[PDB]
Subunit: 282 residues, 6 copies
Amino acid sequence: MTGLLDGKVALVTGAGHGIGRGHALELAKHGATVIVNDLGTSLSGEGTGKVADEVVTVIESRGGKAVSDFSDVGDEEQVDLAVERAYSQLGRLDIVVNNAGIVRDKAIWNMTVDDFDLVMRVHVRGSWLTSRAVARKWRAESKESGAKVYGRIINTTSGAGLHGHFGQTNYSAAKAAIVGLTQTLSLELASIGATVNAISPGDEFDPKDPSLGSPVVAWLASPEAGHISGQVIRAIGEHLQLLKGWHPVASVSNGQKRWDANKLGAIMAADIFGTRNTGLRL
Amino acid sequence: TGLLDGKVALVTGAGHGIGRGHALELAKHGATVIVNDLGTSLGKVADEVVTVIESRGGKAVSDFSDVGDEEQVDLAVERAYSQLGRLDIVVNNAGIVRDKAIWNMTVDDFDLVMRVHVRGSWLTSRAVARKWRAESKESGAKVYGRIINTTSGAGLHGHFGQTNYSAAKAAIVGLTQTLSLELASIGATVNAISPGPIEPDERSEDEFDPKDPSLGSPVVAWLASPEAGHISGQVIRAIGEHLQLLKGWHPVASVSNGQKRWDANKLGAIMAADIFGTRNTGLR
Amino acid sequence: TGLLDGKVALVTGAGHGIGRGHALELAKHGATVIVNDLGTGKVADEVVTVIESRGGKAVSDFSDVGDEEQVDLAVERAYSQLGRLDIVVNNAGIVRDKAIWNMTVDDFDLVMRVHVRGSWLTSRAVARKWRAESKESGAKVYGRIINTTSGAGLHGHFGQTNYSAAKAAIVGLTQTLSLELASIGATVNAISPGFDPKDPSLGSPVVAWLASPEAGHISGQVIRAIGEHLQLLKGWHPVASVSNGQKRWDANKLGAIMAADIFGTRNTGLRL
Amino acid sequence: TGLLDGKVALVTGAGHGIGRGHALELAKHGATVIVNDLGTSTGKVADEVVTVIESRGGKAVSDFSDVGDEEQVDLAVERAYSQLGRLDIVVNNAGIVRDKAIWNMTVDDFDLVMRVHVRGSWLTSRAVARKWRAESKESGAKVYGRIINTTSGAGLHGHFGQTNYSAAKAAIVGLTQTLSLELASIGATVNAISPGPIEPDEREFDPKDPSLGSPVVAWLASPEAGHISGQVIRAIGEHLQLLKGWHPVASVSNGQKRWDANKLGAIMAADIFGTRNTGLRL
Amino acid sequence: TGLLDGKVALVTGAGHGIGRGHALELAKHGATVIVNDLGTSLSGEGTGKVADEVVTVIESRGGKAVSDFSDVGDEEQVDLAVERAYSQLGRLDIVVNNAGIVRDKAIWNMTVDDFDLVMRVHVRGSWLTSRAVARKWRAESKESGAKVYGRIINTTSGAGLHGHFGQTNYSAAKAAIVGLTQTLSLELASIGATVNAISPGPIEPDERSEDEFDPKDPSLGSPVVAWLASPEAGHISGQVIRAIGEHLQLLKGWHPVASVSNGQKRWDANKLGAIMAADIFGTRNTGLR
Amino acid sequence: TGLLDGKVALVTGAGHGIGRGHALELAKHGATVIVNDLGTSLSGEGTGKVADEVVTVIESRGGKAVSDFSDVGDEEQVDLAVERAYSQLGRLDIVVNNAGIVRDKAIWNMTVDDFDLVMRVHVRGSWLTSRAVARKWRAESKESGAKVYGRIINTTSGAGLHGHFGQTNYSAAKAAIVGLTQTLSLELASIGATVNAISPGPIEPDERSEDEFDPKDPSLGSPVVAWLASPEAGHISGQVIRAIGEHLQLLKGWHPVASVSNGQKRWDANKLGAIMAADIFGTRNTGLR
């Protein structure tokens, strides 16, 4: 009788197709007013010729509330305008799902600076711009009220961002950057009550269905998840997983003496990677 | 006979601190070091570091390339090949900080940090990858290549006031992991060091200070050596007393939906009992 | 704004030691504390006086937590006089330590009654009230139960067959109540409470936080708060396992199986 | 030559199911089994089990003591010593279930379950402990003694509708751990089995067979298991498992300052449950 | 370009089974293989020596090999085989110690000759060949002032790591080889040689080459032996590597799983029973502490 | 009533150090100890045999002991020593194999005699005594139709478990003893005997007072040996137990730490380098998979 996100306003970037479209539908299904951001052209062209307007129509025909947005998330002024338009027209911006992205796959020796710059701009600068925009608004509200406020940012990383992948020096760097951006935002926004997490999204059941992680995004954006921040959560196909990050698996001390590069080979071999045996040691 | 005899190494941001320690260390082991830095002394600081290297019996040349600029980076690598024969080693260390909470941070503060750290390391990596790959295709065999990038704790874990620096140093991990996969077949390795106001050459080589910025420099030198050709795509922490191998993201808890869609109205209990363990499962 | 502003909390055995610390801590954070204790002109009044002199709200209660009728009345006298009972901290207890061959059935029964029956009675009393409110509103309600176990309850201790059984029973009671009250929104956790490391009130802030709206997602957990350290505990788990191949076990072979496959006191040898 | 030749064993609640399986197994390995139960079959069900045991070549006698009653328990142990010489083994299995959600549960439902399971197991343990300790003091040497108590999954983990049964089966673990420590010096062992209407003696391999753990109970009662005490052993279906108990999985220090409840939320999230990230900590 | 082009390898007991597979594999990747074996062929034709038959198989497949009939337990014969390799083939780069026999019986039925003979072929043979090349390699390193090329791969087995009923001799021998391997790794490290141990687990392997994958094929570990002997594996030494059937595994050895201190007072044997039970094996509980 | 009252124990190499400590400890707990040693004393008085001196110390402390001068590497002498134990003392319940020698040298400087001799005393000696009592215990079990009492404690060392420069012979020997111990445990289990291995790590131990603690005392592990030889340890067999200085530790052995499947296709040595790096040693990253 009561949806998870009733009364909330959510921005979903790149929500015209695929994963982002699934997010927009899921958030709207749970009662949120969804700002459907996308720049693409509708294949049919009938209407406004804009794919974001098609997603809004789907949301409204299912009983949900949504408006379209055509902001370039890589552009500072346009992001400010999108956030200003949310507060003035919808009262507040409660949820940001940074999903907008592009790929320019090629081995680095065939990759141009435009291929690199553009992928870094849409993924990292875009997520940084929207995060800063809502952070300023949320912190201003918290300082005025003297209490915590509501805030949800869900960023989007990927397997290549966590592990690298051939042909994706730009895309892997961008999706890795988003993990560090997420961890830092979590620490910076903790005291005012907002959470910042990262999703790794990748009757009938298709393990490749792009919307299979969308209920997790919707739940993370809900009041039930106010205690979860700075986490990387993988929701691909059949499985939901919590990931944890970098950790030492082998450690050795120099005894408070400088390392000797002519001895590090044997130390790396025996004490770090285990490719040589140590022998008896007292 | 030094570990790096005959090798040519580029160290970006080698005028002070950690990079200065690297440049000294590589030159000590026989490499000809290209000391890259843009800073001035109290007189260019890269020239001063070259002089220190030479006074200790080493070989070095200065370079003043902006590592964020594509043409200058490509030109510096061409110069290394034309004047010194080859560029075998790249230590990407140049960086800046513009620390503030995100609500006080300008886009320039963000862009500038991302450019020097990530674009710079990507630019030098592409430049040598192209040279190394061309040599490998012409000879039909593997060639020598070493790239050591620089990440940091904030890049691995985040840190208040460092949305830009943390994003940059995290990106470098993904760049390092990917470059390792791309350069494997021609024989080059790509690793990342996590190294953490007196310059290193001004410290007595006998005393041990846990805050010494050059304590990881021998690790960088060894990774650049012919002994480390089997190590690539690794993140290695060398700070103070300890040398550590790190491994990355992994699942610590996992649950299946039984090949039915997740229900957001049910995920609260599942997150509590099966993921984070804040609620008990009971007998199952 | 206190953590527990507007909340009403009952603390059993709040006249001395750990329980008094809990009562003081909850009242400091805005809760109205029902100070329950039977000791001596009555120690529960003395604790109420301390709470009010510090600016808090407290009332005395002299119910025997082992008695069903008195427990049902105390909860009613909380709902009727104070509006609601949001928090129950089950801390009342006694000890009668002796080796089992020297222990009387009364030493056993009385300890089991105060610790286990007392915590069960108060839990049933608020569960019934809380569940009724959920049925009327059709939504989740507020509820906190914090039970008290101890190291002897988790690991055993010489001379404490009664006390160890009682504190162990409270763990299972806590795990089960968490499952039963999950749907209506109440949580049930267990504290193990044991700058001075021997301070009996060192775990009291942990109880206070568990009783707060910030801890609504934590239930069925055992939390150790002793001295310098705060620890989350997890329970029984297999450390060695062997299969019989879907054939019955043979007691004349279990010795070798226990040694090689369970406890590791004998080697297995090469096994294909 | 049976494992339990010359031994006398008491099994409480041995008229049906798990307890009947234990009674059969102990007698199969040579023990004289005291088959205790209060139930009816025609005749008393404990007599029926004695007849089954004897028909298989074993030795057994029936007993109708209410194990929740102190005087009857003391009499049963006295009867064992006077008629059979000694009581070497006690398998505490008698129990009942009164499953209900707590709000529908009566005090009698709670009291009766606690009485039969915990008080009964405590009463028989105290009775034999007194006898065994008296024999050890007279001879100045260690004596033979085995107590096997019965817990269950609900006792270790809880289960909806079983506040009484879960409390009882949890209590038995602490009773077992404590009795092991108290009886160690005289040489007796105390362990706990977790064993999980077709009777066992009329039954191939069925994972739901109530007697599948009975051989484990028999071995624990044998001279081969004198070095094992205070253990919880799970024997369900195909698997035999050794369990270990409560342990810290996350720990944090207050720096020798009092905890602050207004700061504990952030500490619980980052240092205990891991719902928030810690960030870099040098 | 083969992995082992230009290398010379000695494989002991290479006339049949696992060792024959090693000899075939090393030759396939470019090594000149010294096929050592004492056994005779079934036909008796030619020289009657099975090692010559393996050489013929190697050569018809385009490889290089020579036969050797040295008793690896004999000091003088082993020293001669290594000298022959240096004088006729230039150098000895690789030694695969595989020769062995079994004399299975429970110890109470076993003669000392059965014990001695198994220890002699397995352990003394591996020690003798290792010493002979170690002397050559160290002399070459002193002459050149540089590291030299060197590979020793010994052969252990499951019985050597865990024991097996009826194999006191074979288990002792294959365990000794692990300690021998660990020590040789430490002794030869400075000149650059590596020493590892393979745990590899009728129809000869060359008659099964194009055959369908069989998990019981004894030659499935030979590519692992070939790679360990290659220039690519110069950073791996003192390791025990199991290559059986479908799986390739790295093993690690002895380690403490339980530890207790006496508080700098002597142990009391009348108190060790409870300590063993509660603090070492965990058969008794500790209680609250 | 001592732990070992009524038991008869043989300790080989019990004239000095660790073996002497074992002999003293077993006798202190009630055992009649056969003090075996070949060495001479400093005085040369009377028999001039150091084993006779240890017997005197044991008897002067109120214990029971007899001397023995058997060469444990010699089959005839070992079988006779076990016969003498049965005929003169009734039975041999406990064998502590401690006799050994060291001939440390890098392998290239080591003679075959240095290798053979160390292998003979350590491994052949321990195999010989074990076989002798196994025959006695097994015959006694067949006659009685019941299990019998039997304890064998062998001696390994850190070099046997991990290798050590200059000890190819000693490391192989002490490693062989682990496999010997694991196997004997399996072979003697059914008749009730246990076989374990101790890793124990100039003033003789009896020249120290029973109340001082020296972390270098060679007798610090002797109470552990006595407990393993006692009726309380009948459920422990095939174990390796380290008792050095302050610590008592249970060790466990070889196990896989990394594993990879070939997909039921033969390994390719030209692909194993990348597999070793990414899937076994972790020296290269795998990337997204």
